[PDB]
């Protein structure tokens, strides 16, 4: 294999895209010019994760005893409460809709992050050495594409609840007379409150994206740059460390979602 790690490390950042116009596979050496080139790997893995989540929960929801729970039902109702209390202590409107959304967020993002624990080459190695495919990366949240999607969804949900609960008139009043309380400065408030508005999804996405992108990149670098035999003493620590990140980056997404919506309505 004619690979300097000095560029194998680069190939690993490449995306197996489509073009809607061509409906074929965008080769790594030349990228096509269009908005219309799906990251096939992300949509394929993302949903392969989220459907696993939904299935593993529905299979229990179809049976859940009001008696002594199974050792496996136990964990699921455990985390059901772990989410439920976090909803209850912070959101104080009526809307049923918050809690399921937050549960999906927490578990799905947890899995997406969890993607990267596995050795970096293992699935690409399968996708090339056996299954004859050109290229493959297997962490959805190592892409802005998934994260800005989710974040903009939460932005639309802000636009949903902020009107639904305080009407367009109050919505605009906040957006025109906070923070200064004086009509004498409204146009400044109009700028401030709007870019504040968009900070929430922007930061929401980019937080997760950056943390997971870097957690991946360190794995890539460790794989390539080192003599393979010295790599354990520096791949063990980062793996250990990434547990906390994969967990908290999802938990914090959930928490801030709840807080932003609850601040919207209230």
């Amino acid at each position: 294999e004619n690979m300097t790690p000095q560029d194998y490390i680069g190939h690993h950042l490449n995306n197996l895209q489509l073009d809607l116009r061509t409906f074929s596979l965008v080769d790594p050496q030349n990228p096509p010019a269009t908005f219309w080139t799906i990251n096939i790997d992300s949509m394929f893995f993302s949903v392969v994760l989220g459907l696993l989540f939904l299935v593993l929960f529905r299979s229990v929801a179809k049976k859940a005893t009001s008696g002594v729970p199974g050792k496996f039902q136990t964990a699921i109702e455990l985390v059901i409460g772990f989410v439920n209390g976090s909803v209850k202590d912070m959101y104080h409107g009526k809307s049923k809709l918050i809690a399921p959304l937050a549960l999906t967020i927490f578990v799905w993002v947890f899995l997406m992050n969890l993607m990267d624990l596995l050795p970096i080459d293992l699935l690409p190695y399968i996708a090339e050495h056996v299954l004859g495919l050109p290229a493959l990366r297997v962490v959805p949240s190592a892409d802005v594409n998934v994260t800005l999607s989710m974040a903009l969804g939460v932005f639309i949900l802000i636009l949903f609840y902020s009107i639904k609960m305080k009407g367009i008139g109050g919505f605009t009043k906040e957006l025109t007379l906070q923070p200064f309380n004086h009509w004498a400065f409204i146009p400044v408030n109009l700028i401030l409150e709007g870019v504040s508005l968009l900070s929430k999804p922007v930061s929401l996405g980019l937080r997760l994206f950056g943390n997971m992108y870097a957690g991946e990149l360190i794995f890539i670098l460790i794989a390539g740059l080192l003599p393979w035999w010295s790599q354990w003493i520096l791949n063990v620590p980062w793996a250990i460390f990434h547990i906390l990140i994969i967990t908290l980056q999802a938990f914090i997404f959930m928490v801030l979602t709840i807080v932003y919506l609850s601040m919207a309505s209230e």
Binding site: S199, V202, S203, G210, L248, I252, V255
Partner: protein, 77 residues
């Protein structure tokens, strides 16, 4: 020549400053959290809930710049 290295320096600036701000703000907040914990060793979970509540807003803006730094380092360079 100018096409390349100046962007790497720009990303270095971006992400160095991001590191300073994130580490220091998070440190201050966590210090107050642990102090309060040592004063009320019962309330660990309530306190650390509120800790995670606000702590996201600390990283909110620095990770803007870290993301845009990865843009410039790989969306351009």
């Amino acid at each position: 020549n100018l096409n390349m290295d100046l962007l790497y320096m720009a990303a270095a600036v971006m992400m160095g400053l991001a590191a300073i701000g994130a580490a220091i703000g998070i440190g201050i907040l966590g210090g107050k959290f642990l102090e309060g914990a040592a004063r009320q060793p019962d309330l660990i979970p309530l306190l650390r809930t509120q800790f995670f509540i606000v702590m996201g807003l600390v990283d909110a803006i620095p990770m803007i710049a870290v993301g845009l730094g990865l843009y410039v380092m790989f969306a351009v360079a």
